[PDB]
C-alpha cells in the first residue's frame, strides 16, 4: 500500500489540477484519480511529478513497509 500526499502538496503550491495536468501532459482525470486514491501512477509519472514539484518522491508517495 502507498499513501500519497499529492493533493496537499499541490494545493500548498497553489497549483490547480488542470495546471498540473497541463505541465505533466496528462489528463486532469488522471491527477484527480491519484488524489482520490483510485490508483497509483506509473513509475514514470511519479518521477515527473516529483521532478516538477521539486519534492523528494518519497515525500509524495510513501510505501508502508510490509
* Chain residues that interact with a second copy, rule: CB under 8 A: 2, 40-44, 46-48, 50-51, 56-58, 61-63, 65
The entry of a second copy, Na ion, none near residue 40 (CB within 5 to 8 angstroms by kind) is a second copy
Q: In Å, how far from its chain's centre is CA 29? A: 12
Distance CA 15, CA 5 (A): 14
- Residue 56 touches Na ion, criterion: CB under 5 A: yes
Helix (H) or strand (E) holding 4: strand 2-4
Residue with the three cell numbers 500500500? 1
As measured in angstroms, the least distance from the Cβ of 64 to Na ion is: 14
As measured in angstroms, the least distance from the Cβ of 58 to Na ion is: 3
Amino acid at each position: 500500500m502507498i499513501i500519497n500526499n499529492l493533493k496537499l502538496i499541490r494545493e500548498k503550491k497553489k497549483i490547480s489540477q488542470s495546471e498540473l495536468a497541463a505541465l505533466l501532459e496528462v489528463s486532469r482525470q488522471t491527477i484527480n484519480g491519484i488524489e482520490k486514491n483510485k490508483y497509483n501512477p506509473s513509475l514514470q509519472l511519479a518521477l515527473k511529478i516529483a521532478y516538477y514539484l521539486n519534492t523528494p518522491l518519497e515525500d509524495i508517495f510513501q510505501w508502508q513497509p510490509e
